[PDB]
């Protein structure tokens, strides 16, 4: 079985904007600043951002 | 210069949101374009 719905289709403008994520109070985000980083393992230059 | 890709605008879309299909309204009359920056690729390799 399937479930099918329909909706009104006004067309809308669609142009993605940058969205950033921010730490809640009590937390912080560590960031890897290496020029070379393969996605895993130790990063030797780390900074903290919100 | 100017490698051209053949593109089509479609109404029946397989959703990325989950498994399922969806129909969208037909194309807009007028001129539609976008200029984008290619910043990366998704590549795969087999055995």
């Amino acid at each position, epitope marked *: 079985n*399937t479930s*099918v719905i*329909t909706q*009104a*289709c006004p067309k809308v403008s669609f142009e993605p904007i940058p969205i950033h994520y921010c730490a809640p109070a009590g937390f912080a985000i560590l960031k890897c600043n290496s020029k070379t980083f393969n996605g895993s393992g130790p990063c030797t230059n780390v900074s903290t951002v919100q | 210069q100017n490698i051209t890709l053949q593109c*089509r605008i*479609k*109404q*029946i*879309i397989n959703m990325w949101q989950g498994v399922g*299909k969806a*129909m969208y*309204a*037909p194309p807009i009359r007028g001129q539609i374009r976008c200029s984008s920056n290619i910043t990366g690729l998704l590549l795969t390799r087999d055995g």
Partner: antibody
Amino acid sequence: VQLLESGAEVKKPGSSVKVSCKASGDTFIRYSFTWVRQAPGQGLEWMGRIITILDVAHYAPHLQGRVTITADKSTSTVYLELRNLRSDDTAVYFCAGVYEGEADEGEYDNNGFLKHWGQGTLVTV
Amino acid sequence: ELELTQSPATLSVSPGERATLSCRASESVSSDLAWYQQKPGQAPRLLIYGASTRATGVPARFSGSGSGAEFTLTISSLQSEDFAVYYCQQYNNWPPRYTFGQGTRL
């Protein structure tokens, strides 16, 4: 595309009628279909619409609890089923449809016009 | 709800004249309209669809214009074979709630 109607029928109120329509001459799945009714002395009445690429259908407000439209994708046949049938439903029934450019490839245009028509099937109640 | 009516119940015209038919809707159409020609014993063949675009195979006689909820169909140089009942169809509802009007007789 040609649309081929089924035979005439006679029912009593409280029963039901299911009328087939065979569509041929092109690939079935690329055509959208509707059903239209016309009681003698009356104008045309839209009953409903079926999308064949996505099995989805809609019915006119007074038929929502009475009508089901089915597209049999394997036989290229559309069926109109009317339930809880009344003498008020005596009419000539017929199928119609229209081509959706490259619907198979996802270019379906939701075309609301009817170009291909059946002959008219008389159903009395 | 959606209903379409014609101005004339019947249209009194002679062959060779330009017949004028006029459809009015209870709801805005915004060019999503079509016209059909109904003869006794025949399917209601589509002649005009989308504002006034002629369907393939439609005589040049058939043409028209319109906007909003008021649309006109005309038949130039009307022939005797064109003395049909014409129907106006509106299909711009979604979910579909398409209708045909009462029509008019030539």
